[PDB]
Amino acid sequence: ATGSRVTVVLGAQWGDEGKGKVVDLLATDADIVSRCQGGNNAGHTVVVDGKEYDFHLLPSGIINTKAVSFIGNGVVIHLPGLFEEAEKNEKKGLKDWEKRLIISDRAHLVFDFHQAVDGLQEVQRQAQEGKNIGTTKKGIGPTYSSKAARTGLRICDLLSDFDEFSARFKNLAHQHQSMFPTLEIDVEGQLKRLKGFAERIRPMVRDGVYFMYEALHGPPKKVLVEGANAALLDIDFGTYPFVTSSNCTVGGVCTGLGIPPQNIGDVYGVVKAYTTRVGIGAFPTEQINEIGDLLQNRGHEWGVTTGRKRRCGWLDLMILRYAHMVNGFTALALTKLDILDVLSEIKVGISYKLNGKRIPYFPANQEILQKVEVEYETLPGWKADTTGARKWEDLPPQAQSYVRFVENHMGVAVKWVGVGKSRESMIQLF
Template sequence: MSLSTLAFHSHSHSLSTPSRPFRPPLLRRPNVVVCSAKPAVSSPSNLSIDVDGRIGPLSQVSGVLGCQWGDEGKGKLVDILAHHFDIVARCQGGANAGHTIYNAEGKKFALHLVPSGILNEDTLCVIGNGVVVHLPGLFKEIDGLESNGVSCKGRILISDRAHLLFDFHQQVDGLREAELAKSFIGTTKRGIGPCYSSKVIRNGIRVSDLRHMDIFPQKLDVLLSDAASRFKDFNYGPDMLREEVERYKRYAERLEPFVVDTVHFMNEAIADKKKILVEGGQATMLDIDFGTYPFVTSSSPSAGGICTGLGIAPRVVGDLIGVVKAYTTRVGSGPFPTEILGERGDLLRHAGQEFGTTTGRPRRCGWLDIVALRYCCQINGFSSLNLTKLDVLSDLAEIQLGVSYKHADGTPLKSFPSDLNVLEQVQVEYEVLPGWKCDISSIRKYSDLPKAAREYVERIEDLVGVPIHYFGVGPGRDALIFK
């Protein structure tokens, strides 16, 4: 079976069927052809050229946020935009965020805690108070960057208000998932939820606590004892506490040069007219309030998380760019109305290399869900969108768009439902658009895209009501089109 056969099979979920009948496949060409367009010259200098004026006019404080269930390719856009900003800041999440970026030579970097502006040597990277920080992972990431020629010295600032994520949080995450059995959330098991839980019940440990090692052991003992009382398989004793305290004494010494009051720093930077780009982790459909709860993350990866995660005022936040794939993916459990199951989903997964940066888990794949995308745009107030992985659809004869939901009895839904029982039973109405059947990965001008690709893009804009200004047509740093 070829990837092109995807176009002729609608979502096979037993509780969500499209209103359109199947149509037999058309005769397909034996090979993908290359569209007639001059290939762009791959050069780092391309990144500094804002040919269509899309980057220069961005507001002083701008943001890049996910529009789906994460993994949309936010890191690549942040990496490119970072050349036009003084500061790139993470505001929420932790090492469950995996952003893959490439340097000018095409070398691949997988980041988890360090903001994606780090490859631009003139950019300062800030890890804000809303982020949960696993120090062993952070130091490993920094060491990896340094060993590959990326200087981090003096370029990473960590909030003294950020909460520390310990190894035991990761262990508790796994125990919690095992306890849930068939109703497990499908977390990355990086300890994010347990760490935020410690924060919310007010017994968490913050970065600033490392400056008070005289009382640090007592605070850590409270956390470890609580975990041991909750989970019978969590073994805790004096040796464990002693070893952790000694380890964190060493971490504290190494971390100190990175630690600042980032609330003060960010507001001073705004007053000094520095340009700031906020990098979101995860995405709106995983938001603790707005996502498909409980199959969500433990933070607010939507626009509201910018202010609470960095300590900046809403009035200073300007342009927000939503990043969305040309199709839809998600990892873990939870409803997925436009999902393509079985071998057909496998074909799209392998064509798009849909495997998690953080965990390596295969992602679930489906058609672009316009209902969910419109909902995300309402919540965040995006000024523009970045449509990524448009090239992955290049071998399809036809492409489907999930444009609306209906109840099982045929009654239309006016909005994205909060009730998962409703969401699991919705019928998806699809529009079928023609594919372009050619390789677009070398194209760098919107006008050079085949007509069918432009019609697909413009139909998304019509349905969502937000312009698409950026297009990803490949994994490389220069594989970006401005419109």
């Protein structure tokens, strides 16, 4: 009646939890796989039959030639990067993707100078406070800021009267040079490429509202929504201001695709068995030591977009439970359990104490978070190779206890356990 309900895959920590993996797995029989917020600052790794892919703007289901990939109005798109990405995956075998890629005509555009201002703002904050955000420098913040200001431009603007567009492009370019006089912008040059992309994107563009709506009310379809970033990186709920500039939480699905809450079915939270954070900001369970090195190393924890080394720490339940209050997860996907195969003991943060007393809830003030003392619980390691596990029974005793521990302390059920990078390295628990 009201229509089909989409399935959502969201990050529950600070990203890189394995969203590409979970989405790839669920997109096998999906009719539509979509992306709702963020840009190519996102980096999702998919592994199927040896071949490894790293998607940024392309929905991770772009591999499925039977499914339709959709980029929603909440996404911010840098045209050059978009094709740079598609062509790189073409070389990996991706063919006729422009045949199954639809782009919402309301999605905003990330311009060359946006990524430029992004870098400049980072160097300015660093060379003025010794500390900056840790941005991926993909111009995400500047573009979302132009959007809220209503000065930004969108897909439909590029595909319309080009002369009109150009007049706006120039005004926006200037507006930036104003706040950053040391910014160089080849107005006429960048516009030449944008005119070229216009005709390259044209055939794929569609009205997103009508598109999603038609799909959710026509003959039942299986629609999958790929989140980007994660709960604690959410512009509203994350460790502000050390967050990304979009809503990575479940609400972002509605505002980013134009679908009402009743068309939202299962909302899966991707939970990494340990915590990682790439960029600046508070991180309670962070491990700057041998154990931190072993997680970073055994987990190959480096940017799939920037190449930066990620910070690593024990699992942290304070952020997870917080993420659950905002997203209302219906089941979890616990990834990279195998990374813990070697440990004799695995610590997990259960609460935060301040001045001796335990704090009641996750702090809105990030600076506070930088001073909390994490209260840990120590669990026994299983000291066994789980990379070959395929069913609940395979996992040794301690591994199973660790899975329950996450379950119980979150009140949410674990539906999948990740034991490898490839699609097959999964254990559906129900």
